[PDB]
């Protein structure tokens, strides 16, 4: 029903990496990826882009050469998601603030003007046969 | 009076978490939370996402193993709430640029054409009256 | 010329403060604030929020327990500003692809509507004034 | 063709600084700029502002005291390039959310309108005939 529809995806991506991660790293890096609960703190810390490479990534990377793939793919993807959620909430915001509020009038101040043109139509009809019942009564 | 109302909710959160923070951690971390004034600067650093977990929160969590809920809830709450400030501003920014200005130039653009039709609407009724009299005066 | 009126202001504050902190701090921390051009860098990394407190301000604050006003002012101030190039480029951007081309496409559909409405106006007059003429001879 | 047009820019801005970095620091900073990949990563770490100054630039600046150029420039180049891809993505967002329909739904309203306002050019000319034959039938 709107944005929380990626907000689910984000939660899903997240939990996918916490498992992907505890499942490689818990072995040599308990403090970070030991428990599942472990893998999430560490991952939301990565999410905050606070000491992601220097603090967490680089120490794991020298242990597991390929471990960038994980950290980076994760940040790329996980941010590309939040980029949306954000934009989504921008749109979702101004769609309220303005657009809906204004469209309601562009329609209804154009209902008002549609009827205005109708009432002249009728008036010009009625007249128009009076004018040719001066041509039948003359 | 608008978004300025919400930056009161964000000054209350800092306070809720600072008293909460001094009253909790001061004893073992006089560094950060040992007074109020410091437990805010620590909260302002934790808000800027500067070292919040390596420098502050992962040390704290060593001594009280539950304090993550303190920091994860603070980053969330104190972030979501300055998403509102970066939004409501972003909007009442657009609002001045455009909406107020053009929105009013359509109120009037219709106003002016409304009167145009309400003037046409006139003559027409004027003409009817004239044909009507012409009608009666030869029956 | 608009946008860079804030960019010129930001350039200012960067300098206002840069002198500020070379004057106050350059003796106790020559590494960070030694020269002026040394604060120009250091305030650039404070601005991007990289180890600003824990590695710079907290260390200076130990020297001058009131320097936090120097740091917490700059953060707030240079933030609020940095925001408005973003909000400034946003606005001027939307402006390009949409806003400008809309007021034109609309003013001009209203000219036509106006003139169509004008023709009708004169047309009724002449018809009002044939019947004016006809009624006086009747 | 849009934003992946800017996506290549950011990719070719990286590529450049990457080779430039390795051909600059690879002698003294093996772990950071020891190879091309090495630098690509390190720059993503700098690009995400994660620990860039106390960790990379400052300790590098130590050996080449001009290096700030490289780091402070790459920051500004790449972060602006992301502000574009961002914006062109906020706008192409708005477009399909709102501006799409609201511009089509108004052309179709000024169709309705013009037609109505023409419908009565008709009546008003017809009536101007009947009344033109009341003036000659006299
Ligand atoms: Br709009
Ligand atoms: Br009309």
């Amino acid at each position: 029903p709107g944005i929380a529809w990626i907000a689910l995806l984000l939660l899903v991506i997240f939990y996918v990496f916490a498992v992907m991660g505890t499942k490689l790293f818990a072995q040599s890096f308990p403090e970070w990826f030991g428990t599942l609960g472990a893998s999430m703190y560490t991952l939301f810390q990565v999410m905050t882009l606070e000491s992601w490479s220097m603090g967490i990534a680089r120490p794991v990377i020298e242990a597991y050469p390929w471990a960038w793939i994980y950290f980076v793919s994760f940040i790329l993807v996980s941010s590309f998601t939040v980029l949306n959620l954000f934009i989504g909430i921008i749109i979702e915001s101004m769609q309220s603030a303005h657009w809906e509020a204004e469209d309601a009038k562009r329609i209804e101040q154009e209902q008002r003007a549609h009827d205005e043109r109708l009432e002249m139509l009728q008036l010009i009809r009625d007249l128009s046969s009076k004018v040719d019942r001066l041509e039948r009564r003359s």
Side-chain angles (χ1 to χ4, degrees), chain A residues 40-54:
Chain A
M40 305 173 291
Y41 195 97
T42 313
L43 273 162
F44 160 96
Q45 189 201 348
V46 171
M47 254 210 297
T48 36
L49 289 196
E50 191 282 304
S51 312
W52 85 253
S53 165
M54 293 289 278

Side-chain angles (χ1 to χ4, degrees), chain A residues 70-127:
Chain A
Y70 183 92
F71 278 90
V72 147
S73 104
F74 167 76
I75 303 186
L76 294 182
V77 148
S78 104
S79 303
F80 191 68
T81 283
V82 194
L83 184 72
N84 286 31
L85 191 128
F86 171 63
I87 256 154
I89 290 153
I90 251 184
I91 295 265
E92 176 91 359
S93 223
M94 58 195 179
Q95 167 91 254
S96 142
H98 200 63
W99 313 332
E100 279 188 4
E102 167 234 284
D103 269 355
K105 309 136 179 209
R106 283 273 274 243
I107 199 57
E108 191 272 345
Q109 68 130 4
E110 208 50 40
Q111 191 46 34
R112 277 232 232 65
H114 167 53
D115 303 315
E116 276 204 2
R117 287 186 255 89
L118 248 11
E119 202 195 19
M120 284 177 287
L121 283 165
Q122 212 39 51
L123 265 171
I124 294 157
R125 274 192 234 303
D126 290 302
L127 181 52

